[PDB]
Write a protein that binds this ligand. Structure first.
Ligand SMILES: [Ca+2]
Ligand code: NA
Lengths: 424, 426
């Protein structure tokens, strides 16, 4: 449909498996837009954390919105790998003049806090109204002046409060200003360009980069990220109106994971928690390959939480679901769906607000007979095993929205398509 | 009125666009009114200024929501509730306050005070993004509230006493002050996100009420001369816990000339009481006739000509559906009126407000001049009854803006309105 956009978000806490799907939708988009987060997606193997995934398709414009926090070092490392693999990138990568920078002292602030990637500290400077943004790199004198003021405060905090080491002004200034000439030709008025893209009838994909249950308002605060990342964040973070956010595709894993700390009502297994060693959870982790891309650390696993999904559907305005990793359940004798909670002896049908309440939730489960067929690669709904269809039928009911897609494998045609996100 | 349709009402400029009459006008068609951003720095005048409580409260029966994106001062809240109850309204039974709303505490106020040498709003949003904020729900476990307050005070007192040259804020006094609000707040605490979902599912209509001018938006405004949060129309989604699809129609409230309060570049500026180089009698007259005096300090706002290049930017970053023009009558007396339609910057043409203080500060306005009408436009309720020269001015604003003028408010009463399209009808 001319002028129609999709937002692709993870409905859970990340690692939902957005990659195959973003690529699948990028075939119908003329622009792909990052609107939040930092550098937090895979004939040479290349891993992208910052650059929109659309860069893999020739003639697709990639936009880093104002709402991103940008490390120039990570950026140029990715560009470099891309170019080495033969891709033409810089002429079709557009970076908001108002994108917030990650500076060396943000990384040092994270390390000093930990001792007792700089994304939180960057968003902290932003809200503090002292942040240096991309455009500021192009006036050396006033960049140095703001940097100086920022380091006076942050070095006071680092040395006097966190007991750590001061960050050098001149080294920091030299490092930052050393990116200016390379960044210049990509700096752009992304907001304006996005309005023009749609006014010309072209389609945009707004690519989410963190699980929406990590949203700073709606997640299990304080175990959340340092910004909003619900699908409505794409408006402010890209410089467009909410009416451009036409269809919201909610990527949903068939079971749940978390990384790090934060409560998790349906949790089965956490390698670091002796009281959560459920073998079904260990199975989900191994069969699902739920280990960090970089660190190799296992993720926490649990059953799908439809009460959490229902909250997610409401806060994101999810239009339809795309289910992933169904196959990880193939050959379980039974599968459970968390459909609500008991909390302080009361029934609750939506994930509560804040860590304290969500840690008090005992999951209420419905039980389903498993199927044994492999479901790998199936591309029609009717060909799914009855017991898989019954589980997913129940997920739709509790969630309150349709499953529009089921991704059954890494290839484009390993996909059950019930409704096309880019067709009105 | 289309069932389940909502309107988001925002100022298109840097605030004080004169939203009051229109928010009252829209509230006649809405069963709930929602604040989604900001703090006790809205301003809705009554004959008394409401700054926190949503403006729906003036209409009996209408549900009023304080969304999660708000920063809430209990003392400010209970002051407004008391003024409203003394005037004989029933407030508390239909005021719903998000469990996740961020609290403003005394140390936030002390941090602002030390910095000066507003009202704790910025420091509250700083604790939020720092992932250490106390939120409304936190008042109802007194033990863990004290634990987190202790931690916050360790750090904020270090900053206050050793960096900003201010006095420490005492733990126990702060603990007592905040817990003293719990019993009164309790009945009003809610799952606003869920309730809004349910309201729309029942086919009721909601009005999402903007607090600050959208050009103060932290990403899109003249950074750092911006507010400490996002306030573009889109922010109603995160801020109230609803998806962007519920934000059906965005009404852009737009004053017929421009104002700013406090520092920041202002390309079409005519008058700034503190700037000797900006003392144009026209802008002085805009401030007097327009009554542009701060509600607290009483000091004149900065005034200038309508900036349509700024409006064009605001249309885009908000997804403004249609404009509501306000305070046209402030121009009734003028021989001629000027419209900023773009800029010269570094010798080259710009058609949109640039990003950030530096580039906006280098913009010289490009004006089109319009013959004044020298005739009252107070109370006119049809486009065709506007003077030829007022219609010409507004037609050009509409053209440069790129969206329609759907309403002109010509007066403080409901029927002093030109209605071209109804916001609540698909
Ligand atoms: Ca109540
Ligand atoms: Na370029």
């Amino acid at each position: 449909t001319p002028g129609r956009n999709v937002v692709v978000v993870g409905t859970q806490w990340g690692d939902e498996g957005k990659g195959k799907i973003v690529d699948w939708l990028t075939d119908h988009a003329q622009g792909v837009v990052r609107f939040q987060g930092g550098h937090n997606h895979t004939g040479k193997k290349t891993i992208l954390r910052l650059i929109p995934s659309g860069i893999m398709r020739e003639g697709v414009a990639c936009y880093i919105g104002n709402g991103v926090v940008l490390s120039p070092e990570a950026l140029f490392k990715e560009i470099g790998e891309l170019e080495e693999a033969g891709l033409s990138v810089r002429e079709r990568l557009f970076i908001s003049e108002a994108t917030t920078l990650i500076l060396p002292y943000h990384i040092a602030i994270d390390q000093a806090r930990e001792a007792r990637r700089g994304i939180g500290p960057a968003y902290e400077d932003k809200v503090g109204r002292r942040a240096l943004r991309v455009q500021d790199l192009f006036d050396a004198r006033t960049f140095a002046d703001r940097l100086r003021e920022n380091l006076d405060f942050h070095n006071f905090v680092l040395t006097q409060y966190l007991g750590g080491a001061a960050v050098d002004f001149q080294a920091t200034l030299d490092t930052m200003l050393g990116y200016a000439d390379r960044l210049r030709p990509m700096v752009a008025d992304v907001s304006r360009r996005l309005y023009e893209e749609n006014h010309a009838g072209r389609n945009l994909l707004f690519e989410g980069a963190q699980g929406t249950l990590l949203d700073i308002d709606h997640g299990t605060y304080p175990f959340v990220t340092s910004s909003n990342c619900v699908a409505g964040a794409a408006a402010a973070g890209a410089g467009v109106g909410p009416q451009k956010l036409n269809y919201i595709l909610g990527i949903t894993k068939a079971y749940c994971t978390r990384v790090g700390s934060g409560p998790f009502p349906s949790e089965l297994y956490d390698a670091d928690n002796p009281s959560r060693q459920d073998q079904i959870g260990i199975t989900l982790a191994n069969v699902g390959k739920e280990f960090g891309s970089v660190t190799g650390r296992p993720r926490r696993t649990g059953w799908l939480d439809a009460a959490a999904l229902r909250r997610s559907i409401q806060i994101n305005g999810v239009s339809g679901l795309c289910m992933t990793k169904l196959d990880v359940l193939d050959g379980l004798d039974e599968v459970k769906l968390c459909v609500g909670y008991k909390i302080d002896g009361e029934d609750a049908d939506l994930l509560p607000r804040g860590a304290a309440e969500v840690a008090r939730c005992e999951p209420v489960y419905e039980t389903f007979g498993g199927w044994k067929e492999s479901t790998v690669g199936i591309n029609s709904w009717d060909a799914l095993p009855a017991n898989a269809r019954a589980y997913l039928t129940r997920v739709q009911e509790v969630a309150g929205v349709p499953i529009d897609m089921v991704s059954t494998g890494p290839d484009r045609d390993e996909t059950i398509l019930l409704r096309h996100p880019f067709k009105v």
